[model samples]
Target: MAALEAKICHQIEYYFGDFNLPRDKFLKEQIKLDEGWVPLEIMIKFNRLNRLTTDFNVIVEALSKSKAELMEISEDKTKIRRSPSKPLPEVTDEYKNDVKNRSVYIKGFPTDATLDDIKEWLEDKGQVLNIQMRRTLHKAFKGSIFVVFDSIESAKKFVETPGQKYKETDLLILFKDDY
Candidate 1:
């Protein structure tokens, strides 16, 4: 999140310079008032998702940068809406199994497909444990989903007939290990 802090701080400095009063007001409304509404919250969550830091100086640095970045915005940037955020703590394990090794990478899904739709179609595999689908900020199509099944055997069974389709797209199902 240091990256976010740097970003916020930079934005503030970049926007309002060393000016205090106006910066504070802008900061109050933008940073103090809203965290969740900003993508900064996602970076912090990304830290927790990887089981990482929530340190004070960390928060200070992160929020400092975030507030600043929020402040500094070129009209083109506001219109464009992009870039310069912290790296998420890395997910070290690639073969991390969540359901007795009954997980599959369900790729090529339509972006419109939701958790409910995934659940409805895949629940027949076994008791569903979790489903995580990925999407980008600027895209109409969905990316991939990772599915965890209660039973490894059932996971195997489910993939045997993995010819799933959504909105005229065929899904790609691969075992986590095999993928």
Candidate 2:
């Protein structure tokens, strides 16, 4: 959501009003427009506009630094990957149980498999509470899908039983708690 703020700011600053003024002025005008306003919808819009402006400036500053490093990498092309500044967030026991109950990470799926196929398979077994498929920005398959079931028992049952077999040939199956 924070990352999306830059896009929102770009849209608002360049596209919202008649003159398409710069972001600072646009935000100032927005504040003025809603200074005496009382409508709930208008207030919500004002909040969103403020958030967008702040986030956009932050992202632009970060990107300027990133672009400098990227240019250096473009010239060298062989620098080792830098370690990330922070470790992954720890998952709580409650979150683990919730995921165990509702979600399953399935792998070894066929690259050609679609979201519809995964949904159909889960539906045939039991009710699928949610289906989310992850892919690269280029839409390339990431080789897995996370299926959230209605109950933990159902998820456990499916994972224990025929979950390892594939309905179609050339596809294998593997399920894991940690994705």
lDDT of 2 by residue, 9-125 (tens): 333332232122223464445435533222223322545445544443443443234422321111222211111332223467986677565577777667787765776666666
Candidate 1 least-lDDT 10 residues: 75-84
> TM-score, each model?
0.41, 0.41
lDDT value, residue 16 of candidate 1: 29
Clash tally for model 1:
14
lDDT accuracy of residue 7 in candidate 1: 41
**Reference-based lDDT, residue 117, model 1:** 78
Worst 10 residues of 2 by lDDT: 71-80
Q: List the residue pairs that clash in candidate 2.
A: 101-152
Per-residue alpha-carbon lDDT of candidate 1 for residues 1-179, written as tens digits (9 for 90 to 100): 56555544443333223222233453335433333122334333432222334343444444434542433233322211122252222434633443436877888766677656777776456765566676667744466877777678868887787466765788788888888
